[PDB]
Symmetry: C5
Subunit: 239 residues, 5 copies
């Protein structure tokens, strides 16, 4: 519904990325006790609906040392805490090890108002209809030189960024999260696409621009997964 | 307590930040076992109420690989050691992996006397009336260049730091610990706020100042939690 | 098979490198249950032989903390994900610990068209006949300075790279995968050789060229293995 | 072993061995753990003719670390045999090592070139004090440091000492030369009753030119309390 | 054995350094079962004595997190692979965890022919008659600047290295392995000495030469052990 779209598009909303890998002694547990422990997670995510939005991603076989990622949107990070903690306490959750936990807040754009009108218009496009796209998460930390630049300078650099990314507006969906102070990175970037070679070419195009020289850290980890319904993912651990 | 406030405010007091993560095989234990274990911790903290102040924070679901933090204040770090050792020797304690241990001493300010009188007055404000705030801990190591600067130059740079922070005095409470020689960092910074976006905006404001650029290390980890009664944390492990 | 050869030579094909370590408790099992565990993996590979190419490498005793690598070629990474996910859920797979996971795409060369005719001709040679060669996989990330260079400047630097490599065209087979955006590196370099000292001499030759100073990261890990049929490797694990 | 001699003579190896206890140690019966603690104490006593072993409680002060030994020996072979026997005890078998650093004591390289007043002041080295705090800071110098001539390093080390003078009484020091034996150049060791004095000393040294030649400083910085072995071990027998 | 000596002195021979740490759960095994396990390792080594040389070092109590190291010389790394894999599969081997695996090849010297004649003559002495010496292994990675220097310049720098090392030619035995491309380092240096203070003084003398400023990585780990018959090492684990 619009409640979901609200959380996904409005400013001041927190996005949290939580990554998990299943331990080995999980498969030592009797079979039917694992199909049952999966039901618990199914119901818990249903309960927290409304309050928060939980989307699920299969990282297993695409990201090293990771099976599952949640992307969680919440108006108060306190609620995300409470869900994750209840999730980690489920019998399925107890056998998971964390591979990452990052938070950021959505904000109204800082630079877009200073771009040419034709660019502002093009930025209205953001991905397409895609069922079960690939998703990529790339955390980013800027160098001190970036923050020492004044706004006019950073505006020009971000215009160059945007100019380079323009050909990819339809085939790559984006969402930027402002992370500074909530963990060790400044930004969390998130993308969906059906065409990974397009995403690859997009990043290559951005590598040339001046602002991609101000990234003190880029990735670590770069997470790649496929977006799916949660039951399909947990189904794999009950087999 | 006036004793509690003296420890939270006086100079010469040691602050310790002790982070723990719970073992997986804690959950392989029967519920009743885990039940008795939580009550013993409360009693321990009360046994030490005379010597030290212990405050508890839920990190689970907010900081990666961390479930619980204590902030401990004491006039002798021997006392903190004895508490934490006794704590780690409780039935609950026996199952925690340590995820961080940092110490520092409160000092009367080094630079503030050299600021303008208006700035000195503004600094009398330190945060808000806040139950269950978010807490953030950021360890900082300065570069060699910082220490090579003379006092006059560092004063000017810290006035700039302070100037940028002034708008956040009401909504972000701060406490600075001098750490050099007690672990691998120079400072432990501690913050409480009800408004995470304000804290994020405060750090962004400070990224711009010239003192920022003198941080050889900033975070790693950046700890994010919710300040809460211990019982509330303990209860999650009893489920 | 020509289709196999198509996957190994055509552009737009994804190469995935998946590394695994066998658990200490795998050898606890009777060779009987391991013999059938091995047959299960065989079955899965055959089942997937219509969509993907899977090749296997023994890393045990040559690469630290790794026993097995797969190199998988697919037209879609989602096919690779499903294969690796299924493989990790087999009884053998359940007793492996995932290690590294890297992906890249094959591309028609960017620079070769700008090289001298003699060099283009020489580049028609790539390895030679040899059974069960050694294999080496080296992930590489370029510095920002590399991407800020224009195409002409990079072409000249890649000419120098190729010039240093010419004596190794026949003794070392090469395959380059374009990785940016799919994990934390820009390229995955893959080599086969019967003569490890020749490979060592190749890398040394390359160390002198200016391009090799633009490597922000090189290796970590440098994977070294012996290429061989899956059956042989797996029956070494069965005994 | 003559204890004062090991602690003060040149050519003596000092070893810093750090250990954390496995969690499954606590699943052992109390009686088994009592016995195990006697085995460790007896082992130290059996080796007390050959090496000096001093014990420090890191639990609650250093992250991921419960126990440190500082061992002095005339030959690292003796230290090796002691630590290996220790690690084979019932208790030792449940410990994870969290550090192992070695260095030799040496006659001073720079002090002969300092002023006579500084040479005299350096005769003072710390503090009659029971159960002090101890700090261990591993240090690696940058390449530039070794490229300097001896005259230049002498002047820089005089500046170091000048800044440290006020603390000679409240902070005991012992410097070990470690290059080639592990990944660091020096192991620094300090004892104090007054951690704020140690803090202030390190701050005073951060300003000197020499402290800008440290490629690596700490990692880990070990903080502990010096204690009779029996008192440290009794914690584990609960 | 002349064949032992050929492996240790001839060019083109591979040296492998394999470090192991005994898991704690070994010690839960009854003493008798561990006695039988030691026996099995002894016979495996004897079986391989025809093709490779295996020497053993006690790292326990001298190198952090490490109990045992093998130095293996082989004419093909394939042989070393098969030995180490069979060793890791023995019951004793299944309770070891790897703390390092590096390979390098022996080469005829690159710079020696460019030194003065008297220096070439001095380099004829390598080490002493010394039973159960200390052994030190230091992996080294050069910076890009080293490889950018021409051969004449590197020759002069290596002459200065050799000049500083001259006093130690009798007291410290040396063996250099060329590792580039086989793992993440360029060289493995290996030393034997009866007097650790002489080795310390040797490294100190070299820290002053221009070449030692080109070491991007030096150690990590620096391995220190005592050379001894394998039986004695293994005995300790039988207790
Ligand atoms: C269709 C593709 C993309 C488009 C249209 C796009 C556009 C933009 C725009 C307009 C901004 C400025 C936001 C503001 O004004 O506050 C921005 C910021 C940013 N973008 Fe992108 N971008 C794209 C792809 C990427 C990629 C692939 C990455 C990195 C993996 C990336 C990393 C960032 C970062 C880190 C910022 C924040 C920089 C800052 O505000 O200081 N973007 N992007
Ligand atoms: C409302 C928020 C803040 C205010 C009013 C404030 C103000 C100050 C002041 C006045 C000092 C000087 C203390 C002295 O004279 O000894 C100081 C020191 C310091 N502050 Fe802040 N600050 C704020 C937020 C922060 C934040 C967010 C950080 C970093 C995360 C931070 C990091 C530091 C550090 C590392 C020092 C010690 C620098 C030194 O003494 O060398 N402060 N701060
Ligand atoms: C006989 C051996 C080799 C030959 C003939 C060779 C040749 C080439 C050529 C022609 C290209 C340019 C491809 C293009 O135009 O798109 C290239 C790219 C590349 N090569 Fe090699 N190479 C060899 C060995 C190696 C080795 C040993 C490494 C590193 C370990 C390596 C690393 C790379 C990298 C990272 C690139 C991509 C650079 C870029 O396109 O920006 N090559 N190589
Ligand atoms: C009361 C406090 C201190 C005094 C009196 C003092 C004095 C000295 C002296 C005289 C030397 C030169 C030894 C020689 O001539 O060979 C020295 C060396 C050294 N000190 Fe200190 N020091 C003190 C504290 C510290 C501290 C707190 C540290 C760092 C944590 C430190 C680190 C070092 C290092 C790394 C060296 C060896 C440098 C070299 O010889 O290349 N010192 N100290
Ligand atoms: C008796 C002591 C030593 C002597 C006589 C000695 C002598 C030499 C000589 C003659 C070479 C050149 C080999 C060639 O021409 O290819 C060399 C190379 C090398 N030595 Fe030493 N060395 C000694 C000790 C050390 C030590 C203690 C280290 C490091 C801990 C070390 C590290 C190296 C390295 C990394 C190289 C290879 C440098 C290169 O070829 O780029 N050496 N040494
Ligand atoms: C940028 N998104
Ligand atoms: C400033 N705290
Ligand atoms: C080059 N491949
Ligand atoms: C100085 N010690
Ligand atoms: C030098 N070896």
């Amino acid at each position: 519904m619009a409640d979901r779209e609200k959380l996904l598009t409005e400013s001041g909303v927190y996005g949290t990325f939580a990554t998990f890998q299943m331990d080995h002694d999980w498969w030592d547990l009797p079979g039917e006790s694992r199909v049952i422990s999966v039901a618990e997670v199914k119901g818990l995510v249903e309960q927290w609906s409304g309050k928060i939005l939980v989307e699920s991603y299969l990282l297993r076989g695409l990201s090293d040392h990771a099976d599952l990622m949640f992307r969680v949107h919440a108006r108060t990070l306190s609620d995300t805490q409470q869900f994750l903690s209840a999730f980690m306490g489920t019998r399925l959750g107890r056998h998971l090890t964390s591979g990452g936990l990052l938070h950021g807040v959505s904000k109204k754009p800082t630079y877009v108002a200073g771009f040419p009108e034709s660019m502002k218009t093009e930025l209205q496009v953001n991905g397409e209809s895609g069922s079960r796209p690939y998703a990529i998460v790339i955390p980013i930390k800027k160098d001190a030189e970036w923050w020492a630049l004044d706004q006019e300078a950073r505006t020009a650099l971000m215009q160059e960024h945007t100019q380079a990314a323009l050909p990819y507006l339809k085939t790559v969906k984006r969402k930027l999260y402002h992370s500074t102070g909530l963990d060790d990175v400044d930004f969390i970037t998130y993308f969906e696409t059906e065409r990974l070679e397009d995403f690859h070419n997009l990043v290559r195009a951005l590598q040339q621009v001046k602002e991609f020289r101000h990234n003190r850290r880029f990735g670590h980890p770069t997470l790649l997964g496929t977006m799916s319904p949660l039951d399909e993912i947990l189904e794999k651990f009950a087999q």
